Symmetry: C3
């Protein structure tokens, strides 16, 4: 912070508030997904045995197709999908939902399709 | 730069031009805002006493509501708004203007609304 | 990776697959451009003598106008165009194509226009 400034704001009532860092919107998504997908992991006739979430990396075992990988990524566009079925994709917010850079389809919809394509068989 | 290359371009007439780094488009915005909002800071019946701009952090005192914070942020989407009234938001360029990732509304419009919501009282 | 975790996935059949890092979509573009623009560099009546590509920096000599520079850039929006004719611009993916943050026009189209504006004279 080289400007030789002596003191900007400290206009306390920013700093005397119940203050809080933001939460990566990608981080937010992966949580709403971890326990929404492990609440699906209940009604598997057998065939979605595991979801695990590391450090912004999510693995999803689905033996019917092979194993999904879902990632926090540096931009150029963020959130990464590696699907054993539909291939690789990446996603950024448009209007509150996560959308493919490729064609602009929701990954929320791509998971739905592919998860319930599995409940069938 | 490990490619063992000996010399690419130096096609001078890029380098013999009146040359210049770009300016962060967020940086550009915060300036057009600092002196547009301190030219509003004149016609306050009392109630917007201070704007200060550090190092891509802007504070705006508005005692009616509490204190605004406006930030340069690493992407996932850039420019950050912490409003004492409307809450937190983040914004990226769409077509030359700065737009909310949440719903795509202009922050240019959100400030307008909230600044002049204040001139009233 | 400080969580004291002992072992997440290793669900091999991610790791026993023919695996592969992704390729920057900007990197992809600059290649499809290097050899598409050096296949134009053939039918120059004289006037586009050189294209060179370093490390995600591309130079394009076009003596009629002066020299183009095309860059891989950290986001806030990515891929950078410095045109001797149309000025500076930056571009992000929308739906699989590279689009100006300023007004949303394709750079693919901006090069076309300016390259063939040159074949003429």
């Amino acid at each position: 912070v080289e400007s030789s400034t002596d003191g900007q704001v400290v206009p306390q009532e920013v700093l005397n508030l119940p203050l809080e860092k933001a939460h990566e919107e990608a981080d937010d998504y992966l949580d709403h997904l971890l326990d929404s997908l492990e609440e699906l992991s209940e009604a598997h006739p057998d065939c979605i045995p595991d979801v695990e979430l590391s450090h912004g990396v999510m693995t999803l075992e689905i033996p019917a197709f092979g194993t999904y990988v879902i990632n926090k990524q540096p931009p150029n566009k963020q959130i990464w999908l590696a699907s054993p079925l539909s291939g690789p994709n990446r996603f950024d917010l448009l209007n509150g939902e996560w959308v493919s850079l490729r064609n602009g389809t929701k990954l929320t919809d791509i998971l739905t399709e592919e998860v319930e394509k599995a409940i069938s068989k």
